[PDB]
Amino acid sequence: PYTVVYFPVRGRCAALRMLLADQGQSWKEEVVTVETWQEGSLKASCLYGQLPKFQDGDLTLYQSNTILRHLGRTLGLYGKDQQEAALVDMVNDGVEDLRCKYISLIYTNYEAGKDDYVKALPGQLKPFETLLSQNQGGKTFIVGDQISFADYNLLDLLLIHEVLAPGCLDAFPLLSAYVGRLSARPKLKAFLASPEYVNLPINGNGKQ
Amino acid sequence: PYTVVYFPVRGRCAALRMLLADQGQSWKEEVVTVETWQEGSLKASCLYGQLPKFQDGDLTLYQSNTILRHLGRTLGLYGKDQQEAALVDMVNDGVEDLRCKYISLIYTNYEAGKDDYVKALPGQLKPFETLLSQNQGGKTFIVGDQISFADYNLLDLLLIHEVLAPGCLDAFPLLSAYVGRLSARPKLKAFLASPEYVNLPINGNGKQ
Ligand SMILES: N[C@@H](CCC(=O)N[C@@H](CS)C(=O)NCC(=O)O)C(=O)O
Ligand SMILES: N[C@@H](CCC(=O)N[C@@H](CS)C(=O)NCC(=O)O)C(=O)O
Ligand SMILES: [Fe+3]
Ligand SMILES: [Fe+3]
């Protein structure tokens, strides 16, 4: 009953796709080519003129984080109570802020700005190590004792940064074990190894 | 029980303040001076090195939208069901995207960008006009028939844009009536006319 409408890249759909796969949900991928997009028809029909577009039986959604929150809400991946729910949001918004900077780098100032970005990276990742350190010694999830939509988003964020700056997680033991632990989850491991994930570029401009 | 820690500006705390006031909630304002901020201590203690910081009892939060969602969740301003909840998020994420562009203009390119921004503005506001037209003819709220935290955020977005580009809403009848209608709510109207709000600049660099 799920349909993901996006360009042929991981980008802003990698996290939600991981969530879907890890949660054993089935969905349809509706790939939008550059030629199709430039055609202008689809874009004009999009609420904010952008993708991803998500369909949940009659319900149509836009905004990657809205989709993540929707799935987290309907699949029970939003903490045990209101207090944890606020913590989940705090983590996701944090993930979103760094994702915004990452995207800015990739598409507008990769060459001349990568040096600065990477040098500032440790300070951008430390907060997540700290969060893990204050939650059951970082042995479970980013918030509480159950996986939340924020875990998939954080996981993706971490995975794409290791490609940008290999070894960026070496100085952070909790995050490292975290990635390995979540990446090992059966369904998720299978997905991360599949061509569906592996043969799609991270971004759409060939840079990473 | 509620404490807002922020710089002496409206900025990213404007919407959450309107929400709290309109909902008849009481809170404390802890002002952080630029001098204090530059001192470094407080910043170092902030999860992501920024403000606002929000306290709800012993629950400490960061991220303006996390605070809005937390209050929306605890005060019943998040839709009547799960589907409306998703729509509320979609609206708020859209507001956040435009707020981000607005902040970018105000702080990094007011002089050279304002002209373009204003021309591109209509296309950025239309999505919200469209949303209103598909919900009771735009006579109630942005989502459903009860106010949500997204309403407060959108309202602020529209108020600051009216100052940045006087009359920008003349091209959007529903958004215009919307602003007048929400700004009329008793508790909110009193708040917007109070020194607490009026004597605070919209932004921290004097531009608007
Ligand atoms: N705030 C949105 C960002 C959407 C966005 O930036 N979409 C890009 C691709 S990642 C897009 O549609 N680009 C084509 C265009 O803007 O015409 C979200 O998180 O979903
Ligand atoms: N994503 C954050 C953005 C927070 C932010 O940009 N805070 C600014 C003021 S509005 C700040 O603390 N600036 C000082 C600094 O970055 O050192 C949110 O929505 O709260
Ligand atoms: Fe993308
Ligand atoms: Fe601010």
UniProtKB/Swiss-Prot annotation, chains A, B:
Catalytic reactions on record: RX + glutathione = an S-substituted glutathione + a halide anion + H(+); prostaglandin J2 + glutathione = prostaglandin J2-S-(R)-glutathione; prostaglandin J2 + glutathione = prostaglandin J2-S-(S)-glutathione; prostaglandin A2 + glutathione = prostaglandin A2-S-(S)-glutathione
Record-listed E.C. numbers: 2.5.1.18
Keyword Zinc attributed: no
Binding site for glutathione: Y6, R12, W37, K43, Q50, L51, Q63, S64
Effect of A112V: In allele GSTP1*C
InterPro entries (UniProt xref): Glutathione-S-Trfase_C-like, Glutathione-S-Trfase_C_sf, Glutathione_S-Trfase, Glutathione_S-Trfase_N, GST_C, GST_pi, GST_superfamily, Thioredoxin-like_sf
Residues bearing PTM N6-acetyllysine: K126
Pfam families: GST_C_3 (PF14497), GST_N (PF02798)
Function: Conjugation of reduced glutathione to a wide number of exogenous and endogenous hydrophobic electrophiles. Involved in the formation of glutathione conjugates of both prostaglandin A2 (PGA2) and prostaglandin J2 (PGJ2). Participates in the formation of novel hepoxilin regioisomers. Negatively regulates CDK5 activity via p25/p35 translocation to prevent neurodegeneration.
Protein name according to UniProt: Glutathione S-transferase P
Gene source species: Homo sapiens (Human)
